[PDB]
Each structure stands twice: as C-alpha cells, then as structure tokens.
Amino acid sequence: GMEINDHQLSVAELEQKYQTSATKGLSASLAAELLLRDGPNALRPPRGTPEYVKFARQLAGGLQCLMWVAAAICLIAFAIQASEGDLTTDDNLYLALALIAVVVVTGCFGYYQEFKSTNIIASFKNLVPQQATVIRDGDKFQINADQLVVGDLVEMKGGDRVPADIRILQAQGCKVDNSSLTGESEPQTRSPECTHESPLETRNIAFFSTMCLEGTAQGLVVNTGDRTIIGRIASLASGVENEKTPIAIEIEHFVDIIAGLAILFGATFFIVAMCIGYTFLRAMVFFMAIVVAYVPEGLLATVTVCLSLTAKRLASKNCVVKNLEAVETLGSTSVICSDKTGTLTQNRMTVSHLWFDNHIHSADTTEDQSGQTFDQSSETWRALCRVLTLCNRAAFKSGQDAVPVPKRIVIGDASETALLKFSELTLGNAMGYRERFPKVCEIPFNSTNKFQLSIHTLEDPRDPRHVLVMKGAPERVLERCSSILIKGQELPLDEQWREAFQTAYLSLGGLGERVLGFCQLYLSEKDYPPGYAFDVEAMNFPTSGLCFAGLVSMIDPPRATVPDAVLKCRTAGIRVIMVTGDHPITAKAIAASVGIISEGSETVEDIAARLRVPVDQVNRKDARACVINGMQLKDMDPSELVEALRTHPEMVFARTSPQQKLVIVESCQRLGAIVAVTGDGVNDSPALKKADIGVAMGIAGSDAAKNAADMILLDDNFASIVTGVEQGRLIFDNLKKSIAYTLTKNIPELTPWLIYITVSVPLPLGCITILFIELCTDIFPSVSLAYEKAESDIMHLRPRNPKRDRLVNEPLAAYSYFQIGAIQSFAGFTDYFTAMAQEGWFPLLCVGLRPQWENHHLQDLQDSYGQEWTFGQRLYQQYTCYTVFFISIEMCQIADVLIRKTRRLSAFQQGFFRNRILVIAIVFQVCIGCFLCYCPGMPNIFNFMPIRFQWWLVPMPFSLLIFVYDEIRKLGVRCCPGSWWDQELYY
Amino acid sequence: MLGRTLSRWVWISLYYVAFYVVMSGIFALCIYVLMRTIDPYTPDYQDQLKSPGVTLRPDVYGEKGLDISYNVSDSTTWAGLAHTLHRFLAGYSPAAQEGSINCTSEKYFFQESFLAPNHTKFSCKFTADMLQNCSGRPDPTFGFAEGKPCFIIKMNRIVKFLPGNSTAPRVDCAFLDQPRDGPPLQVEYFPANGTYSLHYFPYYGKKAQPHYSNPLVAAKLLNVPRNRDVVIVCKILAEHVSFDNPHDPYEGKVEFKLKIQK
Ligand SMILES: CCCCCCCC/C=C\CCCCCCCC(=O)OC[C@H](COP(=O)(O)OCC[N+](C)(C)C)OC(=O)CCCCCCC/C=C/CCCCCCCC
Ligand SMILES: CCCCCCCC/C=C\CCCCCCCC(=O)OC[C@H](COP(=O)(O)OCC[N+](C)(C)C)OC(=O)CCCCCCC/C=C\CCCCCCCC
Ligand SMILES: CCCCCCCCCCCCOCCOCCOCCOCCOCCOCCOCCOCCO
Ligand SMILES: CC(C)CCC[C@@H](C)[C@H]1CC[C@H]2[C@@H]3CC=C4C[C@@H](O)CC[C@]4(C)[C@H]3CC[C@]12C
Ligand SMILES: *[C@@H]1O[C@H](CO)[C@@H](O)[C@H](O)[C@H]1NC(C)=O
Ligand SMILES: *[C@@H]1O[C@H](CO)[C@@H](O)[C@H](O)[C@H]1NC(C)=O
Ligand SMILES: *[C@@H]1O[C@H](CO)[C@@H](O)[C@H](O)[C@H]1NC(C)=O
Ligand SMILES: *[C@@H]1O[C@H](CO)[C@@H](O)[C@H](O)[C@H]1NC(C)=O
Ligand SMILES: *[C@@H]1O[C@H](CO)[C@@H](O)[C@H](O)[C@H]1NC(C)=O
Ligand SMILES: [Mg+2]
Ligand SMILES: [Rb+]
Ligand SMILES: [Rb+]
Ligand SMILES: [Rb+]
Ligand SMILES: [Rb+]
Ligand SMILES: [Rb+]
Ligand SMILES: [Rb+]
C-alpha cells in the first residue's frame, strides 16, 4: 500500500487499478468521490502540544514538587497561624512566596532552554507546489495541487514542481531534481520505461516535492498527501519520539537521587518528631524545613547558567545551538553518522585529476586552494589547457571579481562550470584568453554527435591557421583520434597508447570520478585559408584523425577542513560512519580521501581482488572497511546489520534512503552508542531528528535539515564538530565540579535542623538565610567552575561510558555530603556555641532550652550567668546564631570551590589563581556577605547580624582542614591508582 | 553482594567511623577550649543586653501582650491574680532573703573581693515588707478587692549594668492614650517614688551573688475606671535605660491591658 509498485504495471493494469483513462483522465465525479475518500493531497501537520503545556510540565519534576509541597505547608501554616490571630508568623507567607518564585523561575529556566520552538512540516510544505495541470473528462485545466487524487492524469513541464507522486506515461526530454530523496541534485531522466525494481530508482516515477528541471511529461497520480515519499520523509522527521538528551538523562538522574534522599530525611524525622513529643502540625513544619534545607533550591539554575556560558563560547566559533542540552551531547558522542554530499563535500563538481604525458596528475580541489597542485611546465599541458579552455561554453556572470573562483556563479551545466572554474584558477582569465582566440565555428554537445566541437582563429598575428578543439566521452573522443601528445612530441596512436589510455580512463572511473577526453587538430592555410567558410551542416571540416591531448576527471571534493576534523574525531575515540544517498564508488573514494577509510584498509571485495580469489572465500574479519548499498541494506536482517557494524570499524553506507539513514542511526543507538548526525539535506532530516544530536550545515543546509537539527554550523566549517567534542567533554567535567560544590553545603544546611529537632537547642539556621546561601552567595562561585580548564588531555580520551560514568555518582555524593559537608557542619556548630557562650549561653544550657527560648510569655529568661533576657533580645541572639552559621558555611565554601577546581591534580601545580572568574566569584561572595551582615537595617529585613571578627575566624581552621584533606586525598589517588584509596575516595 | 563485597562494606564503614570519631573529637576539644576561654563571673559580650527588659506580676497574657481582666464582685475572678502575686513574693520573705544582707548605702554596692560565704559577693536584701500596702499585708488581696490593684514591676538584671547614679531609677506608670473622658492615671508607688535603691547594682551574676534578688516596685493604680478597657504603660526612668525600641515592647517599659469589671 505504502510501497509504489505502479512502475511495474501496464497501462491496462493502471487504468483498471485506478479506474481512470491514461489519455482523458478521471471523471470529475469520481475525482470528487476520491477527494472525499482520501482528503486533500496535502501533508498533515502534526502539531506539538500547546506552548503553555510546555511550561506547565516545566513546573513539575522532583525538586519542583518538593518545593511545591513545602510552599503548601508554609501556606497551611500561615493560614492556621493567621486564623488564631498570631502576627509573628508571616515568615511562612514570605517563605511560600519565595519557594513559589523559585519553582516558577526554575521552570522558566527549563522552558527557555529551547530557543526556537519551530515546526518542521512548515518547511516541508514550502517544498510543495500550489498548482497543477490535470486532465479530467478530456478537459485539461489547472487546479490546486491539494485537489489531486490518486488516479488523476497530470501534466508536468520544466520549471514547475511535481504535484504528487506520479507514474509516468508520456515524456519528452524530461529531467527532475531528486535531492530531497538522495541529497544529490544531479538531474535524472524521466521516461515511461520501467528501469529498476525500486520505485526510488526507476525512470517512470516522479515525486511530489521535486522539481522538473526540463522537458515535459504526463502521468498517473499514484500517491498523494502523507503517502507520498516526501510525506513519509516528513512523517519520519516529525513523528520521532521525544527521547531525552544524554545530559537530560544525567540531570533527571541526580534529581531522582536528591528527591529520594529529601523524602527520606523529611519522613524519618517527622516520624522521630512525633515519637519525641511534638504535635502533628509541628512535625509537618519540620518536614517542610528539612526539605527546604536539604534540597538545593539553586541547583538547576546554576546548571543552565553553565550550559549557557558554553553555548556562548560555541556561538563565538559560528556554532549555534538550538537548545542548551545540545551544548553537551557531542562530548558524549561515540558514533558520528555523516552525510557526504555538501556535508563532508562541497556539493560542487571540481576538476580532480588529469591524464597526460602518460601520467595521472592530481589537481588541488580545496575551496581555498590551500592544498597540493600539479605540474604545469609541460607543453602537452599547455595544449590540453588550451583545449579545455576554448571548448567551453559557460561563462561567469558579470561583476563577481571580488568573489572567490569556487563561489562564483556560472551559466552552464555542472561539468562546464567546473572546467571554467579550473581554467580561471590555473591560467589567468578564462573568458579573456577565450576571447583572444575567436570562435569561427561551433557545434554544442549533442546526443547525436556525442561530442562538442569548435574551430578557432589563433591569436598570433603571424600564424594563419585554425585550431579545432573537441571534448567528450573518452572512448568516443579516442575513436576519432590518430595521434597523441606525449612529452613534447606527437606520436601515432599505436596499440600500446590505446591500452595506456584505457587503463588510465578506467582508473579514474574507479575513483568515483566522471572523465572527459580532450582532443585537438591544427588546420593549415593550404587547405583552409584565413577566411574559410566553416559551415556546420556541410561538415567541410574533418572531425577525425584528431590529436588526443588528455583526460580530465571531476568529483564532488571534500571541504578543506573536513579530513583533519575526521581524523581528530577518530583520535577522540569516536567512530565515524558515512551515510550517503550517492553512488557507492564515489562514496568509497570520498570515504578514503576524508579518512573514514584508512590507508591500507580493505573491503571484502578489495581483498578478493588482491588475491584473485572469489568473494565467497574472503574471511570477513580480515576486511577493516566495508561498503553496503541501500539494496543490500534493504535485504539484511537487523542481526546482520549489527554483525557488519561490529565486524568492520570503517563503514560506508551508500545509496541509502532517508528511512535507511534513520535505521542506521538507531541501530548504533540500540548497541549503546550516543549518536550524532551531520547533514545538510531534506533526505537527512529523519536521521537528524533521531540522532542524540543533529548538526546541520548553516550555508549549504536546506530548511528541513536545519529545523530538524539541534546545532547549526553557521560557516559550514566541519572542524567545528571537533570544537564541540571538546566543549562537551569540558562542560561535563566542570558541571560535576559545579554540582559537587553546590550539594556540599546542603548538609550544614540540614544538620542544624536535625539537632534543633532532636536536641531542642535554639534554632541555629533559619530558612530565609538558607535560601540566601542557595540563591545568592554561593551561585557565582559555582558558576565560575564552568571556566575550569581541562585537567588531562581530554581530546585523546575515549568517549565516556554512558552507563558507568555519570554526572553525580555515589562517590561524588557521599564525599560531598558525609565528609566535607560534615566538616562544614562541625564548623557551623563550633561557631554557634562560641557565639552563644560569649553572649552568655553555655552549651549545656542550650540543650533543651528551645521552649523557653521561643516563649513570648517569657521576657526574663535567665542565661548561664543569671542575666535576664526578653523574647526580643533572645530573638536577635538567634539571628546572630543564623549569621554565625552562615559565615561558617561561606568560609567553608571558599575552600570548597578551591578544592573542586581539580578532581585529580593538586592545586599546587595548576595554582589557585589561573581561573580568574573564580577569584572574582570568591571576592563577590565575600562582599555580598559583608553587605548582608553590616548594612544597617539587615537585622529586621533578612535577619543578619553584624557579627564580630572572631566568629569570622572561628570556622577558618575547618576550611583550611577541608583544603588539606582534599589535597591529601588527591595526592593519594595520584600516587596509588590501583589502591583502595583510589577505588573508594576518588570522585 | 549487597552493593559492595562484605569486606569492602566493613572497610568503608570503619573509615567513616574513624572519620566521625576524629571530627567529633576535634569538635569536643573546640568546646573544651571554648569553656576554658570563658570566665564564670562576667559574660564576654553583652550585645543584646544594651538596655534591660521590664516584666510585671501578675503576668497574664491575652494574645499579643499582657491582658488582665477581673470582676470586683466575683472574688474568684481575681483569686488567681492575688495567688500568683503571693507566690511570686514567697521568695522575698525574710526567711528566703537570709542569704542577703541589709544594705543602707543608697549607693552602688561595688565589691571586688569575695567576703561572703563560700567565695561569694554580698547581695542586698529585698523583703516583701518594703512593698508596704502592696506586700500582701494588711491587705492580702493586693489592692484587687477594692478595685485599686497592685502590679509589681521588675527590671531584668544584667551583669555590671549601671542604670545611672544621679538618683535612683524610678518607675512611672500612666495611660497609653490618656482618655479625653478622664484625668491622668493616679498611682502610689512602693517604695516611695517607685525607686530601685542604687545598692542593688551592679549585679555580679548568679555565681557571684547566688542569693541575689531583684529589687521590686509596686504600682498601686487608684484612678482606673470600671467596665472600661484601658492600656497602662510603665516605664523605667534612668540615665542608662531606654524604652524607645519598636522591636522590643519589653525594653525599658512594660505595657498591659486592664479591665476591672464591676
Ligand atoms: C553522623 C554522626 C554524627 C555524630 C555527631 C556527634 C556530635 C557530638 C560531638 C561531641 C559531643 C559534645 C562534646 C562536648 C565536649 C565537652 C568538653 C568540655 O569539657 O567542656 C565543658 C562543658 C561543660 O561546661 P562547664 O560546666 O565546664 O562550664 C563552666 C565554665 N567554666 C569551665 C569556665 C567554669 O561540657 C559540656 O558543655 C557538656 C555538654 C556538651 C554540649 C552538647 C552540645 C550538643 C550539640 C551537638 C551538635 C553537634 C553537631 C555535629 C554535626 C555533625 C555533622 C554530620
Ligand atoms: C522509623 C524511623 C526511625 C524512627 C526513630 C525513633 C527513635 C526513637 C524515638 C523515640 C525514643 C525516645 C522517647 C522518649 C520518651 C518519650 C518522650 C516524650 O514523651 O516527650 C517529652 C519530651 C518532649 O516533650 P516536652 O517534655 O518537651 O514538652 C513539655 C511541654 N512543656 C515544655 C510545656 C513542659 O521529650 C524530650 O524533649 C526529651 C527526649 C529527648 C530524646 C531524643 C532522642 C533522639 C530521637 C531520635 C533520633 C534518632 C534518629 C534516627 C535516624 C535514622 C534515619 C535512617
Ligand atoms: C585554602 C584556604 C581556606 C581558608 C579560607 C580563608 C578565607 C579568607 C576570606 C577573607 C575574609 C575577610 O574577612 C572580613 C571580615 O570582616 C569582619 C569585620 O569585623 C568587624 C568587627 O566588628 C564587630 C561588630 O561590632 C558590633 C557593634 O558595632 C558597633 C559599632 O558600629 C560602627 C559601624 O559598624 C557597623 C558594624 O560593625
Ligand atoms: C558515624 C556513625 C554514628 C554513623 C555510622 C552509620 C553508617 C552505617 C553510615 C554512616 C556513613 C554511611 C556511608 C556514607 C557514604 C557511603 C558511600 C556511598 O557510595 C554509599 C553509601 C555509603 C557507604 C554510606 C553507608 C552507610 C554509612 C557507612
Ligand atoms: C556554701 O555556702 C552557702 C552559703 O550561701 C552555704 O549555705 C552552704 O552550706 C555552703 N556549702 C558548702 C558545701 O560548704
Ligand atoms: C496604705 O496604708 C495606710 C495605712 O492603712 C493608709 O493610710 C493608706 O491610705 C494606704 N494607701 C492606699 C493607697 O490605700
Ligand atoms: C556618680 O558616679 C560617678 C562615676 O562616674 C562618681 O564619680 C560620682 O561621684 C557619683 N556621683 C553621685 C552624685 O553619686
Ligand atoms: C517623691 O517623693 C519625694 C519625697 O521623698 C517628694 O518630694 C516628691 O514630690 C515625690 N515625687 C512624686 C512624683 O510624687
Ligand atoms: C460581676 O459579678 C456579678 C455577680 O456574680 C455579676 O452580676 C456581674 O455581671 C459581674 N460583672 C460583669 C461585668 O459581668
Ligand atoms: Mg547532502
Ligand atoms: Rb538548601
Ligand atoms: Rb552553473
Ligand atoms: Rb590569426
Ligand atoms: Rb542542501
Ligand atoms: Rb535530535
Ligand atoms: Rb533523538
């Protein structure tokens, strides 16, 4: 049903199947019935869920939901305490509001990660014609294309796009552009003749988006709407399931860890609180406070800030991301599936090789001409160059003198454009030179003569001869020659020269290149006077016994920076696969040229030819390289595709369909690969969507390709992929640094509540000041770890195992929580007891002191000296407690950020001051702390107190202890890599 | 195996127990040195006691402050007020006051040696006698029965705080909004002028003066109208007492609602 088989049906069979007439069309009535049966001939737009539902689910998620529940508990508390007329507990309203702001701001961060929010079927329906000409009841007229139905009889002419998928009945000189299917814009002939098994390859099927470049044809509408081949390409592009990026996986993972541990601590201490005498409402408030303390309210925000600071860096290299997650993925990539035409190559036919003087020469095919040229001293060469210059009909359009020769626009077919650019580049000015030798006679290329010819006055004032120049298919050019230019002389063409020619010609064929022969003849004045009347239809000139000059061959060459980029990715442990719709021989030649196939790699057919032994008997694992075509691939089983991918590290998939590209990508994925896809064409969009990351070419890319992509290369510099690999590996290694620093301080946020509950000391740390730490004083330091340089030689490392190397694993967690976080909590408590005692409250009096502390009916409570304190006085002293715990945590966070600068190296080698953003971050942290402490008013707005310098210093021994402890740990892992000390205390 | 091998679990566990004992010990030693730095007689800092709080007896709280309401006819409505007054005064008996001495200096009682028993400084007696009409005798209803009740105004003690020696610090009670209906609140204070004798100062702390008792002053409210809600403010007048704090209504003054139902 989906599959077109109508290319294999007689006209009788098609007329019966569709109920139509191959000359007069469908009846109007039956066309209307069919239109009501199948709907418009149009692509159905699959709309993604509304713009607000995106934001709604950005407001859920584990941390988000814990914050929700916490704000709900604050609102219930604020309601209950306002209902009994208690005005002091407005903190719960301020707290629920802050939490709600954090939820909403976090969800904004998660929503504005996706910049574009565009649809792909918009760009697909821009490839669709609006009108068609149809024959119904023998009346030919023009309708809207969406009114066409399966069975209609339709006319196409050169210039217009094909209105549906069509089985062709009549055609005159008709040629189409099938780049939306193959990525190749080479014109294809359409006839009514069935020339292939595949409807994708036969000449008598034409497709819906495609342009008819020339000629005229008539045919039966065989598929419409999403059933057309462009409709199915668009279905695959649009309808691929929302799969999460590697870093979303990592983020969701640590969110699950943290939400679980939060629910654990809240629930167990709520149980404990009720066991220990508190009332339900009070234990519920403890659960809210423990969730606020333990959860990192600022974390998701810091992560998307780090992702942004990497997106900025990439963007400065003309590498534009469409969503912050795509900033990581290339760093975790293990297989790259790459389009060839216009992705690895320039999509521009270029002169590549030359046969003359019995040797094959190589031309410089780079777009900058940054490469290796060939030898131009020969006089055979001067003659061949004269021939290929004078026998061209193309021309540069005017005023391009500033444009580089490869970019310049030429009026001519592909080959003549290539020859013209090669002329302009090799000798001075192709058109000026050309005008110096005036054409007196010419026949353009026919399918009858099978060559192109022109006869020319010479430039020399003295020389009165006429030079004839001719080009065409090599064997055809040869069978009209009798001599050949070899090393400054003209030899008769004996059998050995014909053999050498044929060998060279088939060699250049084997490199996937198109070959042209070029010949000459000088016509004397004694037979052709200076004004001889050269008339084409008379053929008064010879056209035989010509002098052969050389072969010139051409290919779509690699973009200059592509081959080194590919070896670089391979050095980073990334596999590179070619996935092209082009023909296999060209595919393999470009694969070899660009480094996808290494010097010395052999396919199974390669080995078979080397040993003159059948393919049957070649041992499959002896072949490092492999070239599978789309037909072969259609024939394989999934297991067979897997065994191929496992058996041959250097893999080329040629002549593949859009769906087949997606199938290769997903086969890699199912084997555990994180896959990137680099392309430029409509035929790449399905593989682009399905890839863990899709990179489109910015200049050469078609709109479907760019829309489906997650990254765009604005200057088409494939080397940018290598930049991306490095930044992704960097941002991952630095995010784990950033995150470890942010989680650490959650434990000394938590423990003061756990002690306050179970020990009933006056409350050491309030929820407002926790938020101030989480959302303000520690944020810039954690972000500054983004700018940390690489510790090791990251671009000679293998891609990370996605299943074993995670952003946050239990070593990082347990170290950050239950070692360093614990040291910080001990600091906080040491400072708390110091400030209490120095203000009159000995440690043992604090145990159980909480109820009298928090009693508004108790204005003369006695302290360890007997001094009498009001509730107000005690409350300010509580705020002093908050502040001294806050400063202990800040001071410890200075050491924290310093030791998170390096997971392996010592800070004595890299130094403390190399990262200057981090130093600015520390200074900003301390400044905003001083502001909070010593700006007047702060005691009655945010509960911060001008603490004494002693309590700034009290926690500093603990901070230094953190530095030293981590410094020694990392020494240990360096000196003892096999050790227990490595295997357990590395993170 | 359960996450790890059992041997690896034991080794990790002992490392964390070691880590935590070492850290707990470092902490304990911090607290120990802290308590050797701390002097047992004078606190290191008095950052939150720049001005003394003031409290009242009998302290009955409505919501958002002291609220006191009783009926002159039903003696059961003031029974508890007189009872907590009696029970507060229990520690100001001449027996309870045996640990203190008779001061007459009418001047700051500065002592820098410990001449009192068990290495102590002397502290001045304050006996309920000194409250006269508001002492529980001869009127054991503390003025409530007659609708002219006694409220006892105590000042929070602070180590080495001196209130000012040009005179004694006094109490002054008055109305918050002096009612256009009526005259100013008329008070008789015991002792006379509602003063705290200077020799009750400075306080040297619970270890130096274990038998210290805060001097009191009873305000006998004579003017209060019946069946009307009034608000009474009592401030301490001294050179070094402030009562302007908006975040502490009990700093240097005490306010309370009063209603004497008839
Ligand atoms: C995961 C497992 C975690 C395990 C956590 C364990 C935490 C426990 C660690 C230590 C326990 C307390 C150590 C106290 C050592 C006392 C040393 C000492 O001899 O000092 C004397 C004081 C008594 O004063 P004095 O009568 O002599 O004063 C008179 C003043 N003069 C001397 C001038 C006359 O002894 C005293 O205070 C006795 C009362 C001590 C105060 C109890 C305070 C309770 C607070 C606990 C919070 C701990 C948080 C830990 C955070 C862990 C993070 C994971
Ligand atoms: C299923 C999950 C695990 C659950 C663990 C439960 C652990 C054991 C729980 C309880 C056992 C102890 C029970 C004590 C006897 C009942 C106490 C009681 O009836 O109440 C009395 C007071 C609280 O009332 P009040 O006298 O102040 O009120 C008076 C009102 N007024 C102020 C006006 C006078 O009790 C006090 O304050 C003094 C008592 C202090 C005892 C602290 C014990 C520490 C408790 C738990 C820590 C264990 C955590 C384990 C974490 C494992 C996680 C994996
Ligand atoms: C590996 C390294 C690990 C080690 C970590 C080292 C971290 C170093 C960070 C640098 C810290 C800088 O510290 C600056 C601290 O400034 C404290 C200022 O102290 C002033 C003390 O004042 C006492 C407060 O008195 C309160 C009463 O004020 C009355 C007078 O007010 C006048 C106006 O002042 C306003 C409040 O002071
Ligand atoms: C110090 C005393 C009171 C607490 C002793 C409780 C024990 C059972 C606790 C305290 C610290 C805990 C460990 C903290 C760190 C880690 C490493 C992590 O990758 C797995 C969990 C694990 C291994 C925890 C297991 C349980 C643990 C060992
Ligand atoms: C300490 O002195 C007090 C005086 O306040 C006395 O009552 C007590 O008996 C003495 N205690 C001892 C142990 O001598
Ligand atoms: C206090 O007692 C004396 C003696 O009874 C009396 O004269 C005086 O009026 C009393 N004061 C008040 C306010 O009743
Ligand atoms: C008040 O105290 C001061 C202390 O500064 C003292 O010198 C002075 O003599 C005292 N004056 C009176 C009148 O008590
Ligand atoms: C305080 O008492 C004295 C007598 O010692 C008297 O002169 C003065 O007027 C009294 N002040 C007030 C306000 O009653
Ligand atoms: C005071 O008590 C009497 C007698 O019990 C009662 O009649 C009167 O209403 C009470 N006062 C008020 C204000 O209710
Ligand atoms: Mg392409
Ligand atoms: Rb937190
Ligand atoms: Rb062209
Ligand atoms: Rb000429
Ligand atoms: Rb393209
Ligand atoms: Rb994708
Ligand atoms: Rb995908």
Residue numbers in the entry:
A (entry chain A): 47 to 1033
B (entry chain B): 29 to 290
Authors' own words:
The H+,K+-ATPase consists of two subunits. The β-subunit is a single-span membrane protein with a short N-terminal cytoplasmic tail and a large C-terminal ectodomain, and it is involved in correct membrane integration and targeting of the complex to the cell surface.
Better-resolving crystals were obtained by using a Tyr799Trp mutation on the α-subunit (Y799W). We therefore conclude that Tyr799Trp prefers the luminal-closed K+-occluded state, (K+)E2-P, and is thus suitable for the structural analysis of the K+-occluded form. The observed single K+-binding is confirmed by the anomalous difference Fourier maps of Y799W(Rb+)E2-MgFx, Y799W(Rb+)E2-AlFx and Y799W(K+)E2-MgFx structures, which unambiguously show a single strong peak at the cation binding site located between TM4, TM5 and TM6 in the middle section of the membrane. Similar results were obtained for Rb+ coordination in the Y799W(Rb+)E2-MgFx (valence 1.14) and Y799W(Rb+)E2-AlFx (valence 1.07) structures, but these results are clearly different from those previously reported for the Rb+-bound (SCH)E2BeFx structure (valence 0.39). The observed K+-independent ATPase activity of Tyr799Trp in the absence of K+ indicates that the luminal gate of this mutant is spontaneously closed, like those of the previously reported constitutively active mutants.
